[PDB]
């Protein structure tokens, strides 16, 4: 009561005092973030920012005691290749909102010190699963490549149509082009045309 | 025909969490649990030894998805010593 | 890395196109993270370069972000290009003075 | 709330060009661009790329003063009193403009671009050439803008 | 004791922003 | 409450302060805005004041992640020519109303001065948008005059029709003439009549 | 068959707001920016980074025009340097 | 990126050069966008120089950008045959002082 | 077929005003201006500036008559150099 609000009052407390902690380390460490995280470097020609695979390995499900069901090997194509404007950051992912409450015995003290703990590590965990989301987003589009590299997916294949001035007595363009994407990346199935590099 | 796996074993395959999954407190060791649908999906490296998921998965590192059932008390073995693993919802 | 440059071999460098000279040995030690072209020209007027472009920029800008230290120009070019890759070429006259910037052409 | 001031003081600021061409390490503070120009006498030993100690105080608070301005590139050269073979004065100033751009940039740089060289005083500012490393034509100099 | 030469009347932001009106219209006269 | 009204109190005092004072440095300017702003040398024969045109370059719009639409360049007749009796002003642009208000507590002298200077710069910033607006008028026009140098926009063609003493017994009008503008001024698509100039 | 792009674009190409807009109070720098229907056009010279227009836009000079998804929080880079910028409504 | 960074080398680099002629040998202003023939035309007038075409101007106009204040007529040329491409391209013969665009 | 100009031209050609009208105060100057109908009809022999006239009249003798739109505040150049005068009502 008394005590779940001494509890409620560290809650929030210790979650926004831990939120802006994380927000100055990611904003002291910035260059590092994008340093390992230039995107533009994945991004493709025509800044198709490509689509995110998914690796698996013995993938058993048991559907149940009489029956299983594995493979071995398994690719799941997340978000597909797409146009994008502006590159992806980190900060879209990893900047913390902060914002700053302080509105409102030794119960009071010692369980605002306990939300004051809860809060913080509740945050952490939050910021875990941020990172784990620019992992899984980063990863993807790198097995994008990947398998491109492999011709296990294909390319996004797409058609520029090109405008020469266009436009009315009002209004003009001089040029327009119009661009496409006529087939996106898939899975290739016919694995006999793959690539299958060995390494030294 | 049986189902493959879960594609959400895909995801837990990583740590994302499945979409509208609760975090499941874990207390004592490395492995992150969520609730979906009764259902725990369970990240971790460690090698499950009591109650036995719907799909298991591995990654390409041999990092295991679990899609298992619930339990409040987990079995891995750790290094040929075996922990036990409480959780929290 | 190693599975890209091994299902492809790498048949040539970019220094026979930028080649180095007097004067483009000058060091640098940049960070950097906007659009190439401001970039390019704050290089060329510390090589006392003529900078030209060829072709018309796109309007999604190519936007590098080069972080090395006390490296010279030469270099300091090819892997801007390098980072630019297949958006943007550099090729340098130095017969002449000029740094010259070709687009893509699309 | 957003800075009226950037962190730095003007006051601090002419403390320092006081106190340093007091100590005669010239400041040229002109128009918007502002210039060091140093003796290499006192930094570099004789026809070495080779810094001192007790220098270094001097040195950081040269980068402590590099911080009072926002600022993009920042140019050093050097030169050097012609001593033996126009290569060497070349590669002695250009060794020695490398070392303390270094050590700067490892320092305190807000600088986006350190562009750095040095000549065997290939431009003298003076003539009378006393002899070689204490001539002020063995120096080494840094130029800026103060950006906005 | 220092001072930068060009010490002149204090301006206001009013007749700045006309300042860069007019040199922007003023140049695009040249050039047309 | 107190807090917002001490603040509106100083929200239209700043506001027409700073009005006034616009005022003053508009009229001893005067000589030097029109001496910028001489649009009887746009205006045309027939004081036909001339379209306003507007530039475009890399009008990129993606409609979306499938498929863009730029063009390089681009034009927008706006405010098409027309008969003027009497050509612009600025300060029929830059003129800023002024009227004085003085129509009613250390919050109230000091909201008072926050507004003050909150209508100030609210002020200022209408100011700023005066100035585009004539920015982009006189560039528009300028804009006429380009592409009419450069045929890449028409002429306005008008029919003058003139008739000879025309009236009653009662009234009469001696020299009547009429002016219709027949054709208006229009971009041309035929870029192949245009008109490309090099300088030197 | 996309769209040229705005031609509000050409307005807020150059400094007039579009038709009914509310000036967002740009703080931290110079560029300018109007909330015409949920969708800010902001005019600046500056390299747009974080957000990511519908329709992007520059004059003969480098202004560009972007029509622009609402952000509370603006990224440019100004010199290869990065600004964030707030904006207020 | 160095592994899938194609390139030409100079040698085959294909582009037109700088023709070195002194009436060629003159700084510019021009900018403008549409289609080259005309720019080429006006600028060898110039140039002093007589312009012949060869080829076929398609029904779609090969069109251009050029937006330089101060610039020689010569990297102009170079520019304009760069952005030409495939379908079109620029020969200059200042021996006879000419400059011909060729279409494809 | 416009109009040729307005007959109340002639009237106001001369120092009538039309019928019906209400004598604008006119202070600052020697014009003088009624409202007819919204329409201030102004005789002067100064050199009507800012406003601009539906139709536009002069004398024999180079007395204007400008059938002009309302305004409070009324331009004229007088010898190359300009006033601005107010009206009430």
Redesign the interface.
């Known amino acids: 009561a008394l005590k779940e609000t001494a509890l409620s009052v560290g809650a929030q407390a210790g979650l926004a005092w831990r939120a802006k902690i994380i927000d100055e380390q990611l904003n002291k460490q910035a260059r590092n973030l994008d340093a390992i995280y230039d995107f533009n470097s994945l991004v493709l020609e025509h800044n198709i920012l490509p689509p995110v695979l998914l690796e698996g390995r013995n993938t058993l499900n048991l559907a149940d005691a009489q029956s299983i069901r594995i493979s071995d090997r398994t690719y799941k194509v997340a978000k597909q290749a797409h146009f994008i404007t502006t590159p992806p950051t980190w900060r879209q992912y990893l900047w913390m909102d902060y914002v700053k409450p302080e509105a409102p015995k030794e119960i009071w003290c010692i369980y605002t010190e306990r939300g004051w703990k809860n809060g913080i590590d509740q945050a952490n965990t939050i910021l875990e699963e941020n990172i784990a989301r620019i992992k899984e987003d980063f990863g993807g589009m790198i097995l994008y490549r990947k398998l491109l590299a492999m011709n296990m997916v294909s390319p996004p294949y797409v058609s520029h149509t090109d405008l020469g001035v266009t436009g009315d007595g009002s209004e003009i363009h001089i040029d327009d082009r119009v661009l496409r994407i006529t087939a996106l990346p898939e899975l290739n199935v016919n694995s006999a045309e793959w690539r299958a590099a060995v390494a030294k | 025909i049986p189902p493959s796996a879960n594609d959400l074993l895909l995801h837990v395959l990583e740590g994302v969490p499945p979409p509208g999954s609760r975090r499941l407190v874990v207390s004592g060791g490395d492995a992150r649990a969520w609730l979906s649908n009764e259902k725990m999906y369970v990240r971790t490296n460690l090698t499950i030894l009591s109650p036995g998921w719907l799909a298991s998965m591995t990654s390409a590192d041999g990092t295991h998805a679990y899609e298992m059932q619930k339990s409040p008390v987990l079995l891995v073995s750790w290094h040929g010593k075996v922990m036990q693993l409480k959780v929290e919802g | 890395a190693k599975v890209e440059k091994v299902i492809t071999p790498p048949s040539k460098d970019n220094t026979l196109t930028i080649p180095n000279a007097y004067n483009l040995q000058a060091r640098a030690s940049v960070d950097w993270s906007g659009p190439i072209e401001e970039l390019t020209a704050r290089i060329a007027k510390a090589a006392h370069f003529r900078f030209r472009v060829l072709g018309k920029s796109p309007s999604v800008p190519v936007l590098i972000s080069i972080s090395t230290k006390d490296e010279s120009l030469a270099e300091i070019l090819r892997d801007i290009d390098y980072q630019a890759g297949k958006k943007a070429s550099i090729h340098v006259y130095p017969n002449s003075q000029v740094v010259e910037l070709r687009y893509a052409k699309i | 709330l957003p800075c009226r001031v950037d962190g730095a003081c003007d006051a601090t600021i002419i403390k320092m060009m006081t106190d340093l061409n007091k100590k005669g390490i010239k400041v040229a503070s002109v128009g918007q661009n502002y210039l060091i120009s140093i003796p290499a006498s006192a930094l570099f030993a004789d026809q070495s790329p080779r810094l001192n100690w007790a220098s270094y105080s001097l040195l950081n608070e040269i980068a402590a003063f590099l911080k009072q301005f926002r600022k993009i590139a920042i140019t050093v050269t050097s030169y050097s009193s012609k001593y033996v073979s126009v290569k060497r004065e070349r590669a002695l100033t250009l060794a020695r403009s490398r070392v303390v751009s270094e050590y700067l940039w490892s320092q305190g740089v807000d600088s986006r671009i350190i562009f750095t060289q040095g000549l065997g005083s290939d431009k003298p500012i003076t003539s009378y050439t006393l002899g070689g490393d204490r001539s002020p034509n063995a120096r080494v100099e840094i130029t800026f803008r103060r950006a906005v | 004791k220092?001072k930068?030469p060009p010490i002149n009347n204090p301006s206001?932001?009013?007749?700045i922003?006309?300042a860069e009106?007019?040199v922007?219209?003023?140049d695009?006269?040249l050039?047309?």
């Open positions: 220092f930068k206001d932001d009013a007749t922003k006309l009106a007019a922007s219209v003023s695009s006269m050039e047309m």
